[PDB]
Design goal:
Shape: flat
CATH topology: Immunoglobulin-like
Helix content: under 10%
Organism: Homo sapiens
Subcellular location: Membrane
Family: Belongs to the protein kinase superfamily. Tyr protein kinase family. Insulin receptor subfamily.
Radius of gyration: 18 Å
Subunit structure: Exists in a dynamic equilibrium between monomeric (low affinity) and dimeric (high affinity) structures. Binds SH2B2. Interacts with SQSTM1 and KIDINS220. Interacts with PTPRS. Interacts with MAPK8IP3/JIP3.
Protein name: NT-3 growth factor receptor
Largest sheet: 4 strands, antiparallel
Distance between the termini: 62 Å
CATH class: Mainly Beta
Strand order of the largest sheet: 3-2-6-7
Length: about 100
Amino acid sequence: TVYYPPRVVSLEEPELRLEHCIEFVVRGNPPPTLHWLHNGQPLRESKIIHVEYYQEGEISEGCLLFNKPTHYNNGNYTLIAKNPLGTANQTINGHFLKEPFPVDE
């Protein structure tokens, strides 16, 4: 492969960042796999929606984070966790922003 030594392209002074966090803690042995649903549908993650772990393994702890969510992010969020001995799912309601009034009759 083509090698080259390390280079820091960018490093910036601190900037404030407001995000909404859906905090979770899951236990399971063996360590469970985690999947999210938004209103029963599979959640599409990105740079706006990202999961951060403070710890993984038998105890998984962290946040599903929202950077600048819209009203479309409103609704139910379900966390499904599965391992060979079972599955588990819990649902919470997330309200981020006001749902606009309807424009049509």
